Each structure stands twice: as structure tokens, then as C-alpha cells.
Subunit: 592 residues, 2 copies
């Protein structure tokens, strides 16, 4: 469970395994039987790690593959790591990985978007080359997060219920890292902030197999507070709060000392509180207004693979357009993104991979919550996905809210019985952040059965698109009516976590009609006018930052075209509309 | 200067410094005066290394910047490296870099496209963090490869003028790393692979520089020792050798051990056993005629500019393999060495080119006022020629052992009309042959320096012609273009009786522009015009190759000739195929591998 982000210290080294690996499909599904991990993969080819495997090859038969694929490389253990605790770590393997070091099985993970690792000290020798084999499986069933159904025809075909392509592979960094045989295994900080903002407290809890001391250092490396033992509270006079748009960070240096060994782990800490009060979202006791995007991890060639240039360029576009926030739609993002948000003061709604709990979007069993679909084991798997997300992200000050799912069908019998325990367990795992369950349009104010269990109303709305098609005048009436009915029903802060229309870049129309750039601008504008008239709306996240790949079908013109930007990051007209609205408002303040 | 590719060995470790660095412009040019390397960069932002700096930020003022920029990060020296020789290496900094480790100046390099490195043993402590600062300059002048002119406006604002048809991207384009050797190490290796006529025997010469006794083991792809030797130099005999063949690329491994009394070093060099030679109008690989198919390329992609990237390299190789391409040219600069490791392993044939494009003031591509004499003290001069010689030396020192590299191109499209041209190029031709006698040389020929006009192609072994009849002239007229093209190729065959590679033929093609009139800029014209070239090539016995310009659409300087860039791609910049990709697929997969097509 304990999952600290590897960082280089006087007591910790890292060796990235990113680069070219050997790669092989297993159409006969005989690689486990033939123990492929005991040899060089036969009939293999070069693949980039990190990256989705699907689009690296310009090959439809690989892109559409369902089953196991195999990655392998050789790596030299640094000579100096003799006597040291050596960990092998995968930041993310989509959706399942099993790992062998030479002929030793070392670890296994279900969940495509959070890290897994094993201590491999006993199975490697410092100064020698070792063989790493990974069996990666991209199949979804009713107990995976997200769910799906594999149909077999004779040949496997993956069915799934979410509007983004089922990219798979080693999407994020692989690495070896070291600790001493005494080490800091875990840290929780809780950051309290007086109402007047003129004092703050920092609770710590540490797990380590040796005596623990902590030093809190400011941005200038001046020690502002010190403590001892596994737990306690640091007092901070006149603290530099972590504020949206700035993101001042302290460093909590955790030392675990044995008589013989010592370990130093620096954790970035942003001093901020988050709370809902009535229909206001407060950060450091001040109302905040969310602007920005639903995103995806999606790009040409690399699929959902992490990439620094893309992270730099996309943050430069969000900065320029005046976005203050985003949501990790619809899975945990690369941790680098949360390190970025921490440092630049970007506000994040951190979401699990639990999209698709919904059989009514655009074969399938009769009852959504039943033994044959979302069941007891599904709910366990969902709890595990929430635990892994919070265990990874609990200390990121940029994360202001947990979204435990996107667009579940809450009409059917058993929805509330499924969600209640998940809402409760989320609050116990992290009491410091509000929780949400992002709401599908047809589960309206008069229909939805679970919104009372959550703190903030995150509504996905597309009136004037899938319904009242091309009619802004009717869409505006229906939208305003529904937001006010939500305000009346629950008196929670409302974030519109999804509003957008498919827009084909370069399609221009004097009739302002669907798919045109001019429609995208008129439709976003109508939404904005309505949001500004409703006092409960504390945010707006446009769907989507950029055009992204989907499953093939008649609704998707080479993918999802709701982007503000093209997949190659070129702006549509609507990017300039958002630039003016979001840079023209006062930072973090509801427009008028 | 000795430049072995770093590889992990029982005696050698590597630590990549790729990732996010601190970045700053220096618009006032006060960073050397204020010694910016002595502290945190002051007004900095995160940048990805490797990558061009220009397009990471969606910011015109950064994209169009001329002068110095500043890169910086901190890094821990691995504790276990104590007692090891520690080297800091940049695979490429475009166009100039100076490097500091804390406050010690350690390195400087001019030349945007090959590696530089320094022994930093004395300036670091194993187990402690050091600060690496890089001052990177992107300015071209008449002594840079490639050349250019910085125009300073009346307000002191710098604008880069340059004479080549690709955008002057700059930054740390390739991997940065620390690596170790023991204090005894293999510093340099040259192999020469000789191949009997009958192909049933081969010999492998070796030469090694190292501060210790040298032994070699040649191992086949199964890791079985086929030959052993001793000393800094000698010859290994190989019975029934598995030749490095185009389309397969079988590799041996030459393990070089340097042993002192106390420590030792093991360096494995991949060796492809193959001979290259020109005989008459044939280009011979392993004594058999070869026919080149494939592309002029560029290092160019969305967002990252000329930055290296594994996913792009995997995807592009899968597109070249699919379309039936057997070869490419590193137009117009040395490419990331990972490309030549790929070519070695899969048997792709490569024309390795220097960065010496732009030696030509009479094209319409690039971009103040051009000097009147191209070869003069005030333009291409003695110091330019020295800088060009240095660029050729550095390329060969890097690539001399890649079996995939079958020919050196020392420049692209110089103006060879003036008398100065032969005076400048002759000594460069001679010095290239001395540096590597195992490969033929070329100088890629511009269209207006025709068979009746050109003054230097006799000094080279292979005629690499860049031709665009029916585009820049005889615009849209396939009938006239075809006559002029055939006439000129036959005039070249008569004049020099060399093998001819068409190293550039292409037309601007806007993806999705379709025409029933088969006229310029349409997908249909791209198809009809490449087809007309193919028909002419197949009627000329001297034509041993065809490399389409270009693999993919790529960025250029803004101007009236370039519709958001160069649109001569077979693929779009996002790697989507134009109709002409399917035309090339049929011709190149329908011919016999490596064999001149027929009518
Ligand atoms: O259809 C769309 O463009 C979106 C989809 O991409 C998104 O995942 C949902 O949360 C909502 C919309 O349905
Ligand atoms: O104009 C063009 O498209 C090409 C250019 O891109 C290339 O660098 C030259 O070698 C030749 C042609 O001029």
C-alpha cells in the first residue's frame, strides 16, 4: 500500500529503464505455458517505453489486439548498490502487469493508472545484467476499473462503455531505485490553516524501521520547524500559504536513523485548507471559481504514454488561455502532472478510472447492479482503486477533491447501496478533502439517487448537442432550469465538469450550425451566460482540452472532436473565446 | 577526437540527465557577465530535455529568439562512482553549448548535431549534488556549418538570416548523460570489414586506443567466439561469414578489453561484415548491385522540433518498412545515433550527411542583403573551410563503424558555378577520403548546377541529384518536365559515368486538396509527378536509387513559398499518409528487393 514517489537524496538513487524494449503479441496465449520470461522473446520487435503499444506500429491488427503482450529488456544493476535495498517500480502498466526478474516472479498489478513495485534485492546481484519480462493484459470485465465485456467470435473483441480508446501498455516510467535497509516507507501530512490565514499547523505521520526526525524548510531552505517520532504537529507562524495561481511549497525532510544506517526523504508540502461552506468551494477560507478543462492522456503516436514536451506545451496552453484548474478525466494521471500542479498552483480534481458504470450511453446484461454485472467483487475492486489513488496523491496540495467515478447510472435498483460504502470509505482514507461522483446528464435533479452522499455537485451537461440539437434558445432554457432545480434540491457548490460540442477544425458556417467553429463559440457562450446567472455554480471545465481518440463508430469523426485544441495542439476559434473570458475575469472569482 | 557511443558494460555505467530542466532567455546578453552559472537561474521555467526550445511554449517571441538561452538542473553523482573516471556528455546542442559544473567551465562545442563531453572526475564528489548550467547559442554566421547571417535591426534586435529550407530549431535536441569508465579504458575503435568476391570469407581489421593492453573477441549473433586477437591493432579472419546484407543486417559483436596491471574495461562494438564500392555506374554492397529506395528525411515533429524521441523513431521506421523503403539520407545534418543503431540492426542503408547546407545564395528558400561573392573573405572563406573539415571529422569519428552508413555526403546543394567552388571543395573531398577510405563520398547537387554548369562532381564517387522539374520550373507541365529530366540524367551519365541517386524529387501537396485537373498542390499531381520521375529513372541505366523528398511535412522559415511549412511530405507532420504513400508502397514492395525496377 505505502507508495512514496522516488526522488534522489544522499541516501536514494534511481535508474530509469525507459527506452527501447523487446515486444511480442501472444495471439496463441501460450507465453505463460512456454514460460517466455526464461528466454529472449522470439519474433519480437522494438517498442518505446513509455508509450501505448497500440499506435507505435501504424498497424490496425496490433492497435485492435485483445489479450497478453510481452515486453522485455536487459539491465545492469549499478555496482555501488551492493548492500542496498533495491526496488523495481512501474509507474503504470495498462491494465494488468506481471513482472519477472530472470526466472523469478516478483510482482503483479490490476489497475492501469497507479504505481506498483517489489523489493528485488534478493533476486539481483550488483554489477550483473538481469532480464526483466512484463506480461501486459488489456482485457476488461465487470470486476475491472473500468469495466467492459470481452466477446469471443470463434477471436477476442473488447466491448467497453467509455468514450476514449482502450489504449494499453507501459504508459509511464519504469525504474530501479535504492533505499538503505533502514528507510522512510510512508508519510502523511495534514495542512491546517487558521481562518485569518496568519498561522498554520502541519501534522505528520511517518512509517519507517528506525528513529524519525523531521525538518520543515521554506522555499529559501530555512528550517521553520522541527519534530521527532513517527507522528506530531509542526507550528508555522506567518506561513506562506499554497495559493491557486502561485503554489508556494515547503519541504518536509524525513530522516529515519538506525544505529548503523540513515535515510533522508524530502516531501513537498503546500500549506492550504479546502472546505465546502454552503454552495461555496473555499481554498484557504476564500471562495474559489474553477476555470479550465476536462483533459485526457492522449497524443499522436504514443497514445496515453507520458511525455515531458507534451506536459510543458499543454501547461503553456492552459496558462495562456487562463485555465486555473482541470480534472483527471477519467483515470489517475501521470504523477509528474500533480508535481507540476503543486509547483505552479494549478487546482486539480483527482479522479479514479471508474468510468463505464453505465449501460445507457452511445449483448449487455439486464441489471447494471447484479451478480452478472457490477457486483460485490466490482465494489471491492473500486474500493482498491480509490485506496491506490489516495495512497499516491494524499500529499499533493494541488489535489482539492476526489472524484470516485464519472457518469454512473444511478436510476437502477442498488446504485445507492453500491455507492454509500464507497463514499464513507473515501472520507476515512482522507478526511481533509471533499469528495464527488461526477454526474451523467440523464440522471437529472429529479432522477439521481446518490448526490446527497457527496460534497460537491460535478455535472456533465450537453443540452444543444445530443438533445435540442442546434437550438441554443431551447438548450439555454432547459440548462438554467436544471441547474436551479439542483441548487434547490441539495444547496451544494456546482461545478460543470463537462460542456462541449464536436467541432471540426476548419469547418466554417454562416448558419452557426452543429460541427462548425462558429457553433462551438455560440454554444460555449450561452453556457457561460447561464453559469454567471446561477449563484451555486463555482466552476466550469470545458470538454475537452484537445481532440482525442475513441473506439470507431458513426458518432466519432476519426475520434472525439470536442477539443478546444486539435490533437496536434492547434487552436479552434473557441480557444480565443475562452482566453478572453478566463483572462478577463478576476483570478478565482465568479464572473458577473 | 575519440567518440565511442556510451554503452552499459560490466565496467561502464550511464545516468541519463533527460527530464525537466530550468530555462531562461538572455535578451540583454548579460548572463556571461553576471556569471548565471554560479546560482539558480533567476527568472526560469521548466523545459523538456531533450527537445528544441522553440515550440515547447506556444510563444512566438521564444520560437523566433536569436542569441543565448540558459539550461540548468541539479544532479546527484552515484555514491559507487568514487574512483571511477566520470564523463559528462551531450549527444547534441544546437548550435553551440558551453557547460559549467558548479562554477567550473568544463566544455564548449560548435556544431549542432554531434556529441561533446569532458572528463568531470576532478569537479564532482560521488554521493553529492552538482549544478549543471548550459549556455546555448543558436546564431549562424559564415563560419558556422550551416552558415547564415545575423541581421541586427536599428534597435539592436537580432534576426537570423539563413539559406536552407528548414526551420532553424535550437536547444538540447538529444540525450544528456553522465557515464563512467575505469581509469584504464578503451577510448577509440576503428573496424574495417573486408569481404572476398565470392562472399565466402571476410577479414576484420581493428585499431584501438586505450591506456592498457588490448585483446578482442569477435562473437556471432549467438554469442559464440568466431575469432580472437591481441594488440592495439590487427586482422581477424572469419570463415563463411554471415554478411551484413541490406534488408537483414546480421551483426557480430567485437568485445574490446583494455587490461592494466590493476583495472580493466570491456567495450562491445556491433560490427556488420559488409563491403561498399562503386564500380562504373553500379553501387555495390557485398559485390552485388544495390538500388536505393526511400526518403530524404528531417528531424522534425510537432511540439518537440528536432528533439529525439523513441515513439517517433519506432512509428517512422514502421512507416518506411511498410512502404518498402530500403534507405534514407540524413538530410541535412547528422541524425541521432539511435537512428544508425536502428539502421545497423534492421539492415537499412544510410547516406550520412553533414550540416553543410546553405552554401548557396541563389535559391528562394530560408530567411537582409546577401554578399555578391559566395566564396570570398566576407562569406565562405578559409575559416569556413576549416569549420567544414571539422564537421566532416566529427561525423566520421562518430559514424565510421556503423555498417548501415554506405556513403558520406559532405554538403547539400552548394553553388558550384564560381571558380572558388572547386578551390573550396577539392581539399574537402581529399581529406574525407583520408578520414575514411572504406566508403564512397558525394556532394549533393543543386538543379541549376546542371551537367553543363557544375564544376566539382568529378571529385566525388556518386552523383546525388536533387531535381524538381515540373515544380519550380515547367510548373505543372509533366510532358516538358519529363523531356528535360531524361535529357539531363543522360547528359550526367555521359559526363561522369558514375552511379546516379536522385536524392530529392517531390512536390508540395496539401493533404485533402483533390483535383480532376491533376494540378499543382493536389494529391493527384503528387502521384502523377512521382510516377513520371519513376518512368524516366527506369529508362536510365546509371540511376541506382530514388529517395523521395520528403518522408513527412516539416517546419520552415515563414514565407510566401511555404503554406505553414514544407508540404512535400509523403506523410503529414502527424504521420498520416497522402495518396502518394500508396503509389510508393506498390512500386517499392512490387520490385525485387535492392534491384533496379523495369519498364
Ligand atoms: O460525449 C462526449 O464527448 C463526452 C465523453 O467524452 C465524456 O467521457 C463524458 O464524461 C461526457 C460526454 O458524453
Ligand atoms: O524546396 C524544397 O522543398 C527542397 C528543400 O526542402 C531541400 O532542403 C533542398 O535540398 C531541395 C529542395 O529545394
Amino acid at each position: 500500500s505505502h507508495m512514496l514517489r522516488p526522488v534522489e537524496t544522499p541516501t536514494r538513487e534511481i535508474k530509469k529503464l525507459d527506452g527501447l524494449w523487446a515486444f511480442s503479441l501472444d495471439r496463441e496465449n501460450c507465453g505463460i505455458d512456454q514460460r517466455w520470461w526464461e528466454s529472449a522473446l522470439q519474433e519480437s520487435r522494438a517498442i518505446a517505453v513509455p508509450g501505448s503499444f497500440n499506435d507505435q506500429f501504424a498497424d490496425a491488427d496490433i492497435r485492435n489486439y485483445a489479450g497478453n503482450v510481452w515486453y522485455q529488456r536487459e539491465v545492469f544493476i549499478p555496482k555501488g548498490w551492493a548492500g542496498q535495498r533495491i526496488v523495481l517500480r512501474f509507474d503504470a502498466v495498462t491494465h494488468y502487469g506481471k513482472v519477472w526478474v530472470n526466472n523469478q516472479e516478483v510482482m503483479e498489478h490490476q489497475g492501469g493508472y497507479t504505481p506498483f513495485e517489489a523489493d528485488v534485492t534478493p533476486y539481483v546481484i550488483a554489477g550483473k545484467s538481469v532480464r526483466i519480462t512484463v506480461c501486459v493484459n488489456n482485457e476488461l470485465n465487470w470486476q475491472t476499473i473500468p469495466p467492459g465485456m470481452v466477446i469471443t467470435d470463434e477471436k477476442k473483441k473488447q466491448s467497453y462503455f467509455h468514450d476514449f480508446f482502450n489504449y494499453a501498455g507501459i504508459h509511464r516510467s519504469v525504474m530501479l531505485y535504492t533505499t538503505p535497509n533502514t528507510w522512510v516507507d510512508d508519510i502523511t501530512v495534514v495542512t491546517h490553516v487558521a481562518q485569518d490565514c496568519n498561522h498554520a499547523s502541519v501534522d505528520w505521520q511517518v512509517v519507517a524501521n528506525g528513529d524519525v526526525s523531521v525538518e520543515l524548510r521554506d522555499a529559501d531552505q530555512q528550517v521553520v520547524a522541527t519534530g521527532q517520532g513517527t507522528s506530531g504537529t509542526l507550528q508555522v507562524v506567518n506561513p506562506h500559504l499554497w495559493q491557486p495561481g502561485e503554489g508556494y511549497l515547503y519541504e518536509l525532510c524525513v530522516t529515519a536513523k538506525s544505529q548503523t544506517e540513515c535515510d533522508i526523504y524530502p516531501l513537498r508540502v503546500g500549506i492550504r485548507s479546502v472546505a465546502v461552506k454552503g454552495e461555496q468551494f473555499l481554498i484557504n477560507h476564500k471562495p474559489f471559481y474553477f476555470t479550465g478543462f476536462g483533459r485526457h492522456e492522449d497524443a499522436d503516436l504514443r497514445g496515453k504514454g507520458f511525455d515531458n514536451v507534451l506536459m510543458v506545451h499543454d501547461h503553456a496552453l492552459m496558462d495562456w488561455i487562463g485555465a486555473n484548474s482541470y480534472r483527471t478525466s477519467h483515470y489517475p494521471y501521470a504523477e509528474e502532472m500533480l508535481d507540476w500542479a503543486d509547483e505552479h498552483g494549478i487546482v486539480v480534481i483527482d479522479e479514479t478510472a471508474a468510468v463505464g458504470f453505465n449501460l445507457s450511453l452511445g449483448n449487455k446484461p439486464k441489471e447494471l447492479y447484479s451478480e452478472e454485472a457490477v457486483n460485490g467483487e466490482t465494489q471491492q475492486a473500486h474500493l482498491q482503486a480509490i485506496k491506490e489513488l489516495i495512497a499516491r496523491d494524499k500529499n499533493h496540495p494541488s489535489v482539492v477533491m476526489w472524484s470516485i467515478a464519472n457518469e454512473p447510472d444511478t436510476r437502477p435498483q442498488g446504485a445507492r447501496e453500491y455507492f454509500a460504502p464507497l463514499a464513507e470509505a473515501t472520507r476515512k482514507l482522507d478526511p481533509t478533502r471533499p469528495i464527488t461522483c461526477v454526474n451523467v446528464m440523464f440522471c437529472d435533479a429529479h432522477t439521481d439517487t446518490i448526490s446527497d452522499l457527496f460534497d460537491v455537485l460535478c455535472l456533465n451537461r450537453y443540452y444543444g448537442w445530443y438533445v435540442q440539437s442546434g437550438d441554443l434558445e431551447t438548450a439555454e432554457k432547459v440548462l438554467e432550469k436544471e441547474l436551479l432545480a439542483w441548487q434547490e434540491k441539495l444547496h451544494q457548490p456546482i461545478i460543470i465538469t463537462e460542456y462541449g460540442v464536436d467541432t471540426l477544425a476548419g469547418l466554417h458556417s454562416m448558419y452557426t450550425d452543429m460541427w462548425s467553429e462558429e457553433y462551438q463559440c455560440a454554444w460555449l457562450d450561452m453556457y457561460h451566460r447561464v453559469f454567471d446567472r446561477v449563484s451555486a455554480v463555482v466552476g466550469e471545465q470545458v470538454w475537452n482540452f484537445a481532440d482525442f481518440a475513441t473506439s470507431q463508430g458513426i458518432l466519432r469523426v476519426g475520434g472525439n472532436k470536442k477539443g478546444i485544441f486539435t490533437r496536434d495542439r492547434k487552436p479552434k476559434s473557441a480557444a480565443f473565446l475562452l482566453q478572453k473570458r478566463w483572462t478577463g475575469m478576476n483570478f478565482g472569482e465568479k464572473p458577473q
